[PDB]
Amino acid sequence: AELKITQVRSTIGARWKQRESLRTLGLKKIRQSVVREDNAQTRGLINTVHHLVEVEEVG
Amino acid sequence: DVRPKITLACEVCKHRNYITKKNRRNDPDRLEIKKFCPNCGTHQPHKES
Amino acid sequence: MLIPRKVKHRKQHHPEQRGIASGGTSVSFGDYGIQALEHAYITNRQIESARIAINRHIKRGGKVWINIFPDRPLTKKPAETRMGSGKGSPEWWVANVKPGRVLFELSYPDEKTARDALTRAIHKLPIKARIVTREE
Amino acid sequence: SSSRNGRDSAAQRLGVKRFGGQVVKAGEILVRQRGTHFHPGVNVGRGGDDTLFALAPGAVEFGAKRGRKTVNIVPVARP
Amino acid sequence: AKRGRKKRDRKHSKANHGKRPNA
RNA sequence: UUUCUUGCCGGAGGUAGAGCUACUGGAUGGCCGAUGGGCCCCACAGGGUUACUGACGUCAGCCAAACUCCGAAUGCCGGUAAGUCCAAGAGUGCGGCAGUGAGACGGCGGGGGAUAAGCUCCGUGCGUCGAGAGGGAAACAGCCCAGAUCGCCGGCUAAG
RNA sequence: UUGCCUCCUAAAAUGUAACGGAGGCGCCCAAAGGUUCCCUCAACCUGGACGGCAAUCAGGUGUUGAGUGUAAGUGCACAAGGGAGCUUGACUGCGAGACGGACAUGUCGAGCAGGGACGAAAGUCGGGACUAGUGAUCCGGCACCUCUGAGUGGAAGGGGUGUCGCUCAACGGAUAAAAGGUACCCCGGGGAUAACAGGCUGAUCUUCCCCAAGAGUCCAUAUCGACGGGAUGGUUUGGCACCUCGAUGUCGGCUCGUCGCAUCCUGGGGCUGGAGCAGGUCCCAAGGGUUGGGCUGUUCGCCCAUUAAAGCGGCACGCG
RNA sequence: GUUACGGCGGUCCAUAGCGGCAGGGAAACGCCCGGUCCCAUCCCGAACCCGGAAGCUAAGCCUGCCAGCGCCGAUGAUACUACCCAUCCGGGUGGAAAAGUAGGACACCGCCGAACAC
Numbered sequence A: 001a002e003l004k005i006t007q008v009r010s011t012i013g014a015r016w017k018q019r020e021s022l023r024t025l026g027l028k029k030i031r032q033s034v035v036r037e038d039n040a041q042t043r044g045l046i047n048t049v050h051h052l053v054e055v056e057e058v059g
Numbered sequence B: 001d002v003r004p005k006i007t008l009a010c011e012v013c014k015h016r017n018y019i020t021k022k023n024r025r026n027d028p029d030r031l032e033i034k035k036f037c038p039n040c041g042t043h044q045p046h047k048e049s
Numbered sequence C: 001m002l003i004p005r006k007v008k009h010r011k012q013h014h015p016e017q018r019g020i021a022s023g024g025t026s027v028s029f030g031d032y033g034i035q036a037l038e039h040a041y042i043t044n045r046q047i048e049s050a051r052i053a054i055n056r057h058i059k060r061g062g063k064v065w066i067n068i069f070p071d072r073p074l075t076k077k078p079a080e081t082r083m084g085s086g087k088g089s090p091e092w093w094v095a096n097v098k099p100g101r102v103l104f105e106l107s108y109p110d111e112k113t114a115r116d117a118l119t120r121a122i123h124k125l126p127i128k129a130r131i132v133t134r135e136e
Numbered sequence D: 001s002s003s004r005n006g007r008d009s010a011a012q013r014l015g016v017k018r019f020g021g022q023v024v025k026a027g028e029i030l031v032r033q034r035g036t037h038f039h040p041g042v043n044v045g046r047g048g049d050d051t052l053f054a055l056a057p058g059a060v061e062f063g064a065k066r067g068r069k070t071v072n073i074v075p076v077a078r079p
Numbered sequence E: 001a002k003r004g005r006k007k008r009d010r011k012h013s014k015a016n017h018g019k020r021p022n023a
Numbered sequence F: 001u002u003u004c005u006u007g008c009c010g011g012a013g014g015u016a017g018a019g020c021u022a023c024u025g026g027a028u029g030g031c032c033g034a035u036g037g038g039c040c041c042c043a044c045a046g047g048g049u050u051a052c053u054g055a056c057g058u059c060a061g062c063c064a065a066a067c068u069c070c071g072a073a074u075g076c077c078g079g080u081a082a083g084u085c086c087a088a089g090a091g092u093g094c095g096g097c098a099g100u101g102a103g104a105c106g107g108c109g110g111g112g113g114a115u116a117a118g119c120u121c122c123g124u125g126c127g128u129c130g131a132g133a134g135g136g137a138a139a140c141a142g143c144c145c146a147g148a149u150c151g152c153c154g155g156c157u158a159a160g
Numbered sequence G: 001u002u003g004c005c006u007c008c009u010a011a012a013a014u015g016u017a018a019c020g021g022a023g024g025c026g027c028c029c030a031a032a033g034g035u036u037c038c039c040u041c042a043a044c045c046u047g048g049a050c051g052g053c054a055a056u057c058a059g060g061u062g063u064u065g066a067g068u069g070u071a072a073g074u075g076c077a078c079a080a081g082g083g084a085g086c087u088u089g090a091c092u093g094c095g096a097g098a099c100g101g102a103c104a105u106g107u108c109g110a111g112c113a114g115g116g117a118c119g120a121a122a123g124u125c126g127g128g129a130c131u132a133g134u135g136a137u138c139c140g141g142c143a144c145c146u147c148u149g150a151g152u153g154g155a156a157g158g159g160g161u162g163u164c165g166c167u168c169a170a171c172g173g174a175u176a177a178a179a180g181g182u183a184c185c186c187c188g189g190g191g192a193u194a195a196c197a198g199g200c201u202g203a204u205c206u207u208c209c210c211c212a213a214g215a216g217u218c219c220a221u222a223u224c225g226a227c228g229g230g231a232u233g234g235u236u237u238g239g240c241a242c243c244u245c246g247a248u249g250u251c252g253g254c255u256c257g258u259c260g261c262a263u264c265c266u267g268g269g270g271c272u273g274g275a276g277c278a279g280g281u282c283c284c285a286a287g288g289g290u291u292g293g294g295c296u297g298u299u300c301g302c303c304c305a306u307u308a309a310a311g312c313g314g315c316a317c318g319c320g
Numbered sequence H: 001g002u003u004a005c006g007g008c009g010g011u012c013c014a015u016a017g018c019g020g021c022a023g024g025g026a027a028a029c030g031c032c033c034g035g036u037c038c039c040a041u042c043c044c045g046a047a048c049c050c051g052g053a054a055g056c057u058a059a060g061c062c063u064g065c066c067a068g069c070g071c072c073g074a075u076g077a078u079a080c081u082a083c084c085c086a087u088c089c090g091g092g093u094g095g096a097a098a099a100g101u102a103g104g105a106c107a108c109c110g111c112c113g114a115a116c117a118c
Helices: A016-025 A040-048 C044-058 C111-124 E002-009
Strands: A002-007 A033-037 A053-057 B005-010 B016-021 B033-037 B042-048 C032-036 C040-043 C063-066 C072-076 C089-097 C102-107 C129-133 D029-032 D044-046 D052-054 D058-065 D068-074
Touching (some): B016 B033, C032 C111, C044 C089, C044 C102, C044 C111, C102 C111, C111 C129
Antiparallel strands (some): A002 A033, B005 B016, B005 B042, B033 B042, C032 C129, C040 C089, D029 D052, D058 D068
C-alpha cells in the first residue's frame, strides 16, 4: 500500500526522537506531505510522530 | 610498628630482594622464607634484615 | 495508640500516595467496613479516635478490627529551624491509605448502630470513606 | 543538631560491559561485578576482583548452568 | 493567599492548558 | 554515514507494579498444644485442672527505601535491514580560536521540607526561556500554538 | 564535615546531588597466603550422674536450609564455608594481547626463568570469597648496577634498579616553617548573601464545622465541648532568599489620616441554663463615637479615676 | 535387533524433586566376611586395599503406578507503563506482570558392554 503522511503540527516542543522520525519520513515543514510504503518501518515512524502528522491511504 | 615493613634479603646474593609486612608480635624472629633472588637466578632462602 | 514495637529504618521516605489499594479492599473480618476513597497518611491518633468512636457507639457488644496499622514514621524537624542539617526525628506514625482500602471492620447485630458507628469513625478520619459490607 | 551521615564511596561502574551478541577480543572485560553474579562460562575467565573477561575472541552469550548465570564466548566463523 | 491562589488558578484556562510558569 | 529515526533480532537488569508460608522486620481467629501461675487428685511418683500472661505452629487477610519467590514498560549495550537522498549541516579523530562552568520555570520520577514555598537538591535524545520575535493566555521570560531571509493594501490554518 | 569502602536514595545499563537515610574505615593474616586432598550439621525424640536454655556425644530428617577474619552481591553440602599435608605460588622475577575507568585506579589470557603443591592422572592452579585497609610530586635517604666520573695513568665528586621517610586526615597534598581582635576601622564588590520592609508558603499563629463522647442539678448542642477531622486570614514566630546593599531609615511617642469587620450603642433569634423581672450568656445586620493620668524603652502589660464604650487589625509592624 | 541388566555421558538443571504403593538378580551396580600384602583413621579396616563367592536384592540401583507436598503454569483481566490526547478528572495506541482455577508433569537422548533368537 501507500501512505500519504502530512505534517500538521510543529517540531517546536517535540522530542528528539519525534523530530528525527519526522525528518526520516522526509517532513521538514508543516503541511509537507510524503508518500511512503505502508511497511513496518513507515508504521513505526508514524507511531512515533502520530500526534504530529495526519496519515491517509493513497488509493 | 606492630606490622613493620620488613625487608627480605637473600642469604647467597645478599640482595634485599623483597619487602613485606610481618606482625612482630606473632613472629618476633627474623622471617626466614624461600624466595626468588633474580641475581642468583633461582629460589634461595631469604631472611629479614 | 498504635506504635510499632520497632522499625528497621526509622527515617523513611514518605509513602507514595498513588494508585488504588491492591490488598485489603474487602471486608475480611467483620460484617461492615470503612473503605477509603482518597489517599491519606492516616495517623495513629486518627486510628485511635476512630476505633474509640466505634467502640463507644456500639457500647457493649460487637467486635472491631483495625486493618491498617500506622507503622510508617513521618519525621518532623525542630520548630523554627532552617532547611538542612539532616532529617527530622520521627514525629507521626501513619498508615499509607489508598482509595479502596478497608480501614476498619465491625461486627454488630444492629445494622443501624453498626452504620452509625462507622459513620462516627469516618467523621474522625481525614478522608472520604464509605460504609461497605461483606455481602457483595 | 547535625547529621551523622554524609559519606559514600565512589561508584565502581560495575555491571555488564559487553552484552549478548557483542563480538569481543580475547582478554576483553565482559562483566565488572562483585562476586559471581555471573559465572565464567566457555572461553570466559574470572578475574581476581570477579571481573569476567573473554579468554578467546568471539561473541558474548549469556547462558544458564545449574541455575547459575554464565557468560560464554561463542567463536565467530571466519569470513 | 488570594494573590497566589488567583495567579496559580489562572493556569486552568483553555489557552494555558493547565500549565503556567511559576504554577 | 560510521551519527540519528524506525522495524526486527540477541542481551544484563530488579525500578513501576505487586508478593511474601520465598527471606529480613508485621497481623484477627481458633489449634495438637510451651512457664503454666490457679483447683488440686491430695505423691515429694504421676496426672486432668488453665477462668487468665499466652510457645512454636496454623488460617483469608495485610505493608517496606536501604525486603524480594517474582517482575514489566521505557531506557541502555550490540547486530541487522532500511529511512533520512542537490545529505542531517549528523557522528568520529586531529589541530581552530573560544565562552561556559550563577541558570529559570513547566511536565514526569524522586530526596530534604509539613510529601509548604515562585523553596532546595537530583534524574529526564523532556520542553521552553535563557539566546526567541510572531499569535493566544486581559496585562504576564519559562504555559499553549509556532521558530521571524526581505517585501505584498493575496490565500489556508495552529493555539485560541 | 572534608580522603577511601558498602548499601539505599538512584527513577531495573553506567553515572547522578543535598548539612539526605545507614554503616564502616586508616587494618589484620607467615600459616586467615598457594596448592592437593577430604568434609558435612541448623532440632525434636530416646537419652546421655553431674552435663537443663550446653559438652564428649550417638541415630533419623530438617534438603541445601544452617551457620560461615570485619556492613551489599556471592559462595554450600557442585562447598569462596570446615579440617588436613606439603614444606614455603609465602607466584616470585622478566610479562605480546586485549581491555574496564580523565590523571590516578582496576582485570586477566598468555610466553620465559625459577621454583610450590598435586602426581599415577592430567599437565593444571600469578596474595587473601571480592570491593576500603591509603598520600602525588619535590626533597632526601638505604642496598645493588655492565651507567657518569668537569684534562686524566686514574680515582674521588651524580644517575639507574628496588625500596624507605608525610593524621601532607582541609587526605590532588597553596610554606620546610603560622593564632586571634577590630564598634577606630578602611577599601573592592554583592541584593550572588543576612538584618527592615515587600513577595511566596502558612509549620506556627489567628478566626471559623461534625457520627458529638462528656460537662452543663434531669438533658450532647442555653453555654460549652474531649478524642479526631477540615479550612479561612496573612495581624506572630518562622521557612525561602524573589526586588532593593552606585542605601527601600529602625522601635516607641507626636501629627494627620484612610480602610476592613473578625460588633465595645442602634435591630433581631435562642436561652428565658433568668420559669420571671433589674440584668446576662451566646449567634446573625459600620453611621458616628470609642477619655484622662501613674508605673512602663516599653512592641506588651499592670494600676488610678472615669466612660455608652474605653474594639481588633491593614495601610513599608501607615505616617522621620 | 530386544531386557525390570549395566556403566559413561545429555537440559536456559524440580514438568526432572520429596513422599506413598507395588517388582527384580544370568552378567553388571551393590550387600558382605579376616587383616600375610599398598594405603588410611586428627581414635576407629566406618571412608581407601587384599582373597573372594558360603550367602542376600534388606538398603542403594533401576522399573511401573499414585498429583499428597513441592515444581511448572497458561488464555483472559487487572496493576504498571512508553508515547499521545486531556484546564483540575480521565482516556487512546503499543507493551504487559505472581495466585488460582483450566491445566502440565511422578522427566527428556546417544556410546559401549552382557544374555536371548537370528
